[model samples]
Target: MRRKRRVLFSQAQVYELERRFKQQKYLSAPEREHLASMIHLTPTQVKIWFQNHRYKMKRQAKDKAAQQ
Candidate 1:
């Protein structure tokens, strides 16, 4: 049987990802792969992270607008 391993990114990794996200919300295949290599994460993980981050930002914006 094979056990799944959990990978946790460091603060600097997350910071770099967030900084890149601010520059571009979407990424191409090569860009995504390069980012994953740079951050030591799988491409799938990088893809999911960007997807969730965009969703969270959109939700936050909607909530803030509703408060106004």
Candidate 2:
């Protein structure tokens, strides 16, 4: 079985990706693939990042709701 390669992007690269993803929550498939390619990652990684980000945002929102 072939092991999946785990790529790690630098902080700057992650920042750029996060900024773009945040600016547009609903990005097209091509857009995501392009962004991931620029960061030297697979499209699946980009999708996973966005998925994690969305969950983080939701968690923060829930925390804020609890505080209020």
Candidate 3:
């Protein structure tokens, strides 16, 4: 059976990752793996975190545009 992916990061972890992402838009696979290790998460989790964060920002921007 395929296991479900666990990609939820702690608030502190996500905060740091978000900061790094803002400073550097693209993260190489090796960099992602290193970050995952630092955060005690799987590499795949880190990848998914970036993906979700990207989508979240897009959604928020769209909402803001609608408001203006």
Candidate 4:
């Protein structure tokens, strides 16, 4: 069986994504493709990363609210 390769983005790349995430939680198809090109990731990867990041942030916020 062949194993899939893992893509580990650099902290800088993650920071860029995070910075953009703060500005907009969602990206249109063209925006997504453009960012993927800029960041050297596939559009699908960018989409999935944003989706997971948004979910993670929402969970953290919910937890913080519960704690408060």
| Selected candidate, larger TM-score, 1 vs 2 | 1
Pick the winner on TM-score between candidates 2 and 3: 2
Which TM-score value belongs to model 4? 0.70
Error of 2 at 7 (Å): 3.8
Global lDDT of model 4: 0.79
Q: How many clashes in each candidate? A: 0, 0, 0, 0
* lDDT value, residue 9 of candidate 4: 66
TM-score of each: 0.70, 0.66, 0.64, 0.70
Please identify model 1 stretches exceeding 4 Å from their true place.
1-6, 61-68
Worst 10 residues of 2 by lDDT: 1-10
Better of 3 and 4 by TM-score: 4
RMSD of each: 5.5, 5.6, 6.3, 5.8
List candidate 4 segments past 4 Å from native. Answer: 1-6, 61-68
Q: Pick the candidate with the highest lDDT.
A: 4
List the global CA lDDT of all models.
0.78, 0.71, 0.75, 0.79
Q: Candidate 1 — worst ten consecutive residues by lDDT sum?
A: 1-10
What lDDT does candidate 1 reach at residue 67?
62
Error at 1, model 2, angstroms: 27
Greater lDDT among 1 and 2 belongs to: 1
lDDT of 1 at 58: 69
| Better candidate number, 1 or 3, judged by lDDT | 1
Error of 1 at 29 (Å): 1.4
